[PDB]
């Protein structure tokens, strides 16, 4: 089940994890093997798999027109990297003891958690608002001055 | 493993589920159309009408090889996931270089300014090297051309056309 | 115009991949020939010194097979990796196996055979 | 955890900061579990000194939520730990502390930010309007690591002379 999340907090959906066009990825419904408390968490978790997929579907896109889009989503792919790297990790350390819960993976991606939120709003400001040109080298830097270290 | 399957695949070769839980086949398209081009491409520029056509072809073969260099060298055997995400950023820039192509097309100098107009296009963004590269060897044999008599603004246009045939008429004298 | 068996019972995964190198054996096998005939004397002045300067070539693709077996032996050498190794190869053999069939086909000798290297990386 | 669901629902930086360090040490505890006995009465007396830590930020918190404008927001919450300080005045102490730092970081830049690049409360009240003179003068010249500096005379003005040299 381990591997099973880790390939749908990357972006690929299966049985355990429906995807839905609308609300996003959460957990189908309560499953026996494993606890009926769980069932929150991973839905916690899945609020982190959404942003990705929903980054990663537009970056694809590249949906509007201009360069200073393309290589918007361009540099918006280098600031994502660190969260698949941090996500290869994750198998490595499960591949050595078997002892590790949801718990551990859940604690892992920490970072990632309270930062694609603050990111997930300027994506949505340019796709509803038309923001051709260069006028995005400013709506990035209005949302550039946030108090977030990360950000 | 199928690791070795689905690495094979940028290289053209058929694999046993690929042929000319269970939501990996939509994770597989997404690397597996990126293999489509591939062979979309040397079933286009596999010759060795037109000079410069030919550089320009001659051009693409010194990239794809880079492509089958990259392959086959990092992983011998990495995760599932590495795979998709590791090529993106690349796998992406394949699927940008068909709609150059057309997998009609100009010839002649028709061909050498059409690509030009794809810098300035898209100049700033991560498709700068890769077209000048070609563009840089693209014009490789038209200089020459232009190397024996010695859109754009016509105050030049007629006056390369007798700057060379001075050059052509002093060679029989 | 060499024809050439693999296998009845072999990978489809490598068959395809076999007859995209064999196209430089076949375009060496009629080089090969080549140098071995138009070096007997009632052929001129020229489709001699023809066959000399078109045997260093010949040399130089030998050290290249010699290099390849002598990474074999490591297991360095995956068929993948052949492939690409042999690129320069499939280019010059595949230029000298035109000439030397261009220049039997009409049989010249003299300067006949000193026009066509003219019209002809 | 109710102080800790609500915590997740909802600066913060320094909070999450706290909740990674924390998280490790419950965290190491479940490898002693499935690899010596355990039972409930040695599990919670072991964490004693977390239960307690956690009980002070319900209540540093819970004025950090019962509040709309922006600098209203602010103020009162940056305000309120500098008093939760003085009341506390050791482990406890190390918290708000590190606590404190990661939450004042905003405006130490600005105001260094406003000084090279150009309903109140009396703690600085007999210097305020040098800071006012100051501060203004300052964003007119630009058109044409203090806490550093209090801290160190501990061990052994700042505001003035810096002032001296804008107005001169």
């Known amino acids: 089940m381990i591997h099973e999340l880790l390939l749908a907090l990357s972006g690929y959906p299966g049985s355990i994890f429906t995807w839905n066009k609308r609300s996003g990825l959460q957990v189908s419904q309560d499953f026996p093997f494993l606890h009926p408390s769980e069932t929150s968490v991973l839905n916690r978790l899945c609020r982190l798999g959404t942003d990705y997929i929903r980054f990663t579907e537009f970056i694809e896109q590249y949906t509007l027109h201009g360069i200073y889009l393309r290589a918007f989503c361009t540099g918006l792919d280098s600031v994502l990297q660190p969260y698949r790297q941090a996500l290869l990790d994750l198998e490595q350390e499960f591949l050595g003891d078997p002892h590790l819960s949801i718990s551990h993976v859940n604690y892992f991606l920490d970072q990632f958690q309270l930062l694609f939120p603050s990111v997930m709003v300027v994506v949505e400001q340019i796709k509803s608002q038309k923001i051709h040109g260069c006028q995005i080298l400013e709506t990035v830097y ?7 270290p990360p950000v | 493993e199928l690791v070795k399957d689905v690495l094979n695949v940028l290289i053209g070769v058929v694999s046993a589920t690929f042929s000319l839980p269970e939501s990996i086949s939509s994770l597989l398209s997404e690397v597996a159309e990126y293999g ?4 979309r491409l040397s079933h286009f520029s596999l010759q060795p009408k037109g000079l410069v056509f030919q550089a320009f072809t001659s051009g693409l073969r010194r990239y794809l090889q880079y492509y089958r260099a990259c392959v086959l060298s990092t992983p011998p055997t990495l995760s599932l996931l590495t795979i998709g995400f590791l090529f993106k950023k690349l796998g992406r820039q394949l699927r940008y270089l068909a709609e150059l192509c057309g997998v009609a097309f100009p010839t002649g100098v028709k061909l050498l300014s059409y690509l030009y107009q794809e810098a300035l296009h898209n100049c700033s963004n991560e498709h700068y090297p890769v077209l000048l590269s070609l563009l840089k060897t693209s014009c490789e044999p038209y200089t020459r051309f232009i190397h024996d008599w010695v859109v754009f603004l016509k105050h030049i246009a007629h006056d390369i056309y007798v700057c060379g045939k001075t050059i052509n008429l002093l060679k029989l004298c | 115009s060499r024809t050439f068996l693999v296998d009845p019972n072999l990978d489809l995964s490598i068959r395809e991949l076999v007859h995209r190198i064999l196209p430089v054996a076949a375009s060496y096998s009629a080089v090969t020939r080549f140098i071995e005939e138009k070096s007997s004397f009632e052929y001129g002045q020229v489709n001699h010194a023809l066959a000399a300067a078109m045997r260093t070539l010949v040399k130089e693709h030998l050290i290249l097979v010699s290099q390849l077996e002598q990474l074999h032996r490591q297991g360095l050498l995956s068929l993948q990796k052949l492939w690409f190794y042999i690129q320069p190869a499939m280019r010059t053999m595949d230029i000298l196996a035109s000439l030397a069939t261009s220049v039997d086909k009409g049989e010249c000798l ?6 066509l290297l003219h019209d002809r990386q | 955890g109710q102080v800790v669901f609500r915590l997740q629902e909802f600066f913060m930086w320094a909070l999450y900061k706290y ?7 419950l965290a190491e505890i479940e490898k002693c579990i499935i690899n010596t006995t355990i039972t409930l009465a040695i599990v919670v007396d072991k964490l004693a000194p977390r239960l307690s830590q956690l009980k002070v930020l319900h209540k540093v918190f819970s004025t950090g939520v019962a509040e709309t404008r922006n600098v209203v927001r602010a103020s009162h919450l940056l305000n309120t730990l500098y008093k939760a ?8 102490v190390s918290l708000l502390f590190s606590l404190w ?7 130490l830049q600005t105001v260094d930010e406003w000084i090279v690049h150009g309903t109140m409360v009396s703690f600085l009240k007999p210097v305020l309007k040098q800071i006012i003179m100051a501060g203004k003068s300052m964003q007119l010249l630009k058109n044409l690591e203090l806490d550093d500096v209090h801290d160190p005379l501990l061990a052994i003005p700042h ?10």
């Open chain 2, 36 to 39: 489509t081009c591939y062979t």
């Open chain 1, 142 to 148: 209005k949302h550039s001055c946030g108090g977030l």
């Open chain 4, 101 to 107: 730092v990661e939450t004042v970081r905003p405006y």
């Open chain 3, 110 to 115: 003299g300067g006949s055979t000193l026009s």
């Open chain 4, 19 to 25: 909740f990674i360090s924390f998280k490790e040490e």
């Open chain 4, 85 to 92: 300080i003085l009341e506390y005045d050791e482990q406890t």
């Open chain 4, 159 to 168: 505001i003035d002379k810096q002032y001296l040299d804008c107005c001169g």
